[PDB]
Amino acid sequence: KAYHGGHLTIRLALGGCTNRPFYRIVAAHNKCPRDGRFVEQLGSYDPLPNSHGEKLVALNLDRIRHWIGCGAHLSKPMEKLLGLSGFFPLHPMMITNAERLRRRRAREVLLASQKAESEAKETEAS
Amino acid sequence: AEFFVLTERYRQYRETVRALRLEFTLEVRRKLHEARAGVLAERKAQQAIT
Amino acid sequence: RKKVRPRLIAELARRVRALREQRNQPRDSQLYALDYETLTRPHSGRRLPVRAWADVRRESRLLQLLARLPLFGLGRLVTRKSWLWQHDEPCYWRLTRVRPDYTAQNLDHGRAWGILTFKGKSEDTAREIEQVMYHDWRLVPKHEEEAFTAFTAKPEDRLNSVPYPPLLRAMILAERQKNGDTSVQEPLLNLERTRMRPWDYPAKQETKGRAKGTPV
Amino acid sequence: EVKKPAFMDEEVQRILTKITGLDLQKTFRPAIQPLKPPTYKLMTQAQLEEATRLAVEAAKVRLKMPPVLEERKPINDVLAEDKILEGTETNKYVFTDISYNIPHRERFIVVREPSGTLRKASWEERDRVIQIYFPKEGRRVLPPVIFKDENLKTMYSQDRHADVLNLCVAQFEPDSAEYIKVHHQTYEDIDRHGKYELLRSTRHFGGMAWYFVNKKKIDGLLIDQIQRDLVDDATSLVQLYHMLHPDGQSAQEAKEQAAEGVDLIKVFAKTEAQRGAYIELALQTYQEIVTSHS
Amino acid sequence: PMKGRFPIRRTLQYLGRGDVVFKESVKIMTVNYNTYGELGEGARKFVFFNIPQIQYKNPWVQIMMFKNMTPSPFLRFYLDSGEQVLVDVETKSNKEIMEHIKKILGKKEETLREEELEKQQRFHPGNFGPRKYCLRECMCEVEGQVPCPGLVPLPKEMTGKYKAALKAST
Amino acid sequence: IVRSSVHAKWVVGKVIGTAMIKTAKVRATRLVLDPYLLKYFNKRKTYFAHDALQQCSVGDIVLLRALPVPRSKHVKHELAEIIFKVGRVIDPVTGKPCAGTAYLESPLSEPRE
RNA sequence: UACUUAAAAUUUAAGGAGAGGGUAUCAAGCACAUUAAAAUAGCUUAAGACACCUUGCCUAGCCACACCCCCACGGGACUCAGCAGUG
């Protein structure tokens, strides 16, 4: 298609089959389809653990730096991937979500202790 | 409490990422100039003419 | 080729359509009219967001304040309730030019110009003011101008340089050793060149779009 | 300090090449692969000799020895320890820089563990992912099963030592422990069964003799070289042993007596040979046959 | 039997044997040769055997040939700068003519190799995609990675159909 | 002094007509490979060229230079040079007049006329 | 996106080395040329002009279309060629 307006972006293009997702990191005009025309492939992401239990990310860090230097935006999942790698700082919401999960498990642990204490009262009743 | 902490993380995160985008923007232009008018570029042009 | 032929009707339509737009341009009194019972704009039927309902009933628009002043308040200081609540430091516009909407039966819609002073720091040139149709403006009294505009700058404490990300730092140190540069200096990013304005900083009204004149 | 000789030293490469030998029929033995109809050229005796010379030039490049290196040291470096991410992930992430023009030993391959530690990928992890993104013909992502001791012993029974080593060079890196393990296992099997001829006129002979010299067990290779009438090779092997062990009793004895040729082998037998009695017997028998017949 | 004389000239292998790749300056190569004579035999053979190979490697260069216009055969190259390089090929073998033009106006082996490598810069083995452009279409092809569900059924717990059933059960 | 966009910055051809004022119709030929036969044949193209002095005659080989701006719809070249004049050829190698594969003036002589 | 001026992505317009469906019982087209005092009588064409017929192609994708009148001021027979569904 003949796009008018838009910018280059670095995003994940979904491949694979049903229940078997696989991603291609690509640089593409933002108005293009998710799996359609791209400019360059900048790596790949396999989100399923392999035989060794490792999720495999490939990053062409030379070309990624080239396209960020030319104005390429980043999708939020790709900003998270660069943070885990260490190439970018950890994303604000990666830290916030980790804090929310910590606060949510603290409640669960406290409730289990309260239930155990309530169960202890049942033990006292016999 | 969480809204304010998150607002500060976004400001500090986005400043760090702007500094890195600028560093990358400079390497692109440095590499381009070296190729266009670097030492090696100039010598080859004259070497061919000679 | 040579079987591609002119399209006169398309040429006629484009020009004619553009001409009608210029002739029947709407005015600010129409585009920004509001029905306060429903908080919906009659021209387009757009219902204002929920977080704006309290202020639309509780605050005034800029030219509602200026229409009551001699010379439409040229030289006066005007601030916004949103700024007063968010920023402790003085934020205001110094009005320089004001073009009321004469069509409005109360001269309560129009455009304005001034010099911005945001968070105590003043710009050097006048530019057009954005969000003039908002219910957020508060005229500063003349007797309170001196106390309002009093600001003492604090030494800046936001860091000027930060470390590099963990992987990008190792790639820099690795390249140093490869090229023969022996040093234990820590790579540092410089944040001074790329410092962001606050999100609520006034934007450029001149480059902003205007809504179309086709009613819904 | 007198530098310890290296494998690639021009002097060592000369001696190792000589003892290895050349055989255009063994070096260019027919490959069991998809075939094409042969071509034919009418050539004079000069043209044929020129073509044989080019064949010997190619056989030299074919016999180039593979590197002999010391075992790499485990990579244990932690780039970061971001504990905020502890418990937020169940599986490790492995990030590989796939920029084309970087040497594989200079690429950054990091691992983000579930605990949050960002560390460098180990040697085993580096080799696996480099095969996945820069696949090399002959190499497989996961270590093959032929290298198990039971499977390797089968290959040795079939006298397929040059194959075990050609596979060990396609799959493993020269500095890896797996590479060193298989080579030292093949070289040890050749010694016990006196199968030194299997690796002659091959690129793997030099490493085998190198391994024996460093481990002070050249006795078997000398006894076999002498019995095959290759006594110039046996003398060169004793020179290489007197070069990598200068302070050895044998090397000091040869300087005292200025021994050369067959004398060098006799000196080794008396001084440092594990089985000196046999080296003299085989050496003596060779002299008797040479003298008696000619 | 392929028609014409020397039908090997009409094979891609023969056309690709040419080694004269002109510099970017070369724009036109006029060939003036005589059809009859004894000193112009090499020129006639050069038109017969070599001109096809030169055109094949230099498709954008205009080769125009004129016959029996002058007493002797010659080659005149027209360059982009406006320079005109005259070559005299009388009493010269066709092989000699090719070597002469290769020396004066032919790209060197080093230059051609650099161009080939630069052409392939954007092909990466790790890249995934169609067979026309990439070695592997999907990561399922890689050894050790989760195989394609079409070839090998996935475990039930890794399936959305199963996960949805449990959520309903909860 | 930017150059033309057209690919044919320099074209050689034969003047097949000269009936337009100050313009010469020139036929150029290039070699094009037949993909089925793998043999080269001649593809001919017509180029209008600006002949300011009307110094061109039918049958003479000429060199054309691409004009920076097209003079008209079809005139996008000018007459750079007349390589060979029809019937008035001058041997490039020796510099002597020739009439076919023969010298009108011997190269041994030095007439200087 | 950087600077208050330079690197990209994405388009648009004018072009042309070369390549590009069928019918020659479609063999002529009829202004299709140049010059620039405004004259000259030229331009394309059996190396296939012009006319007609048929077809999406260039395939990581591209191009054209968006109820109909090539277009869409206007007019008309007045909208699923978005998903599902119906005659």
Ligand code: FES
């Ligand atoms: S083709 Fe790779 S998962 Fe099916």
Ligand SMILES: [K+]
């Ligand atoms: K249409």
Ligand SMILES: [Mg+2]
């Ligand atoms: Mg806003």
Ligand SMILES: [Mg+2]
């Ligand atoms: Mg008929």
Ligand SMILES: [Mg+2]
């Ligand atoms: Mg319809």
Ligand SMILES: [Mg+2]
């Ligand atoms: Mg339409």
Ligand SMILES: [Mg+2]
């Ligand atoms: Mg439908």
Ligand SMILES: [Mg+2]
């Ligand atoms: Mg619709």
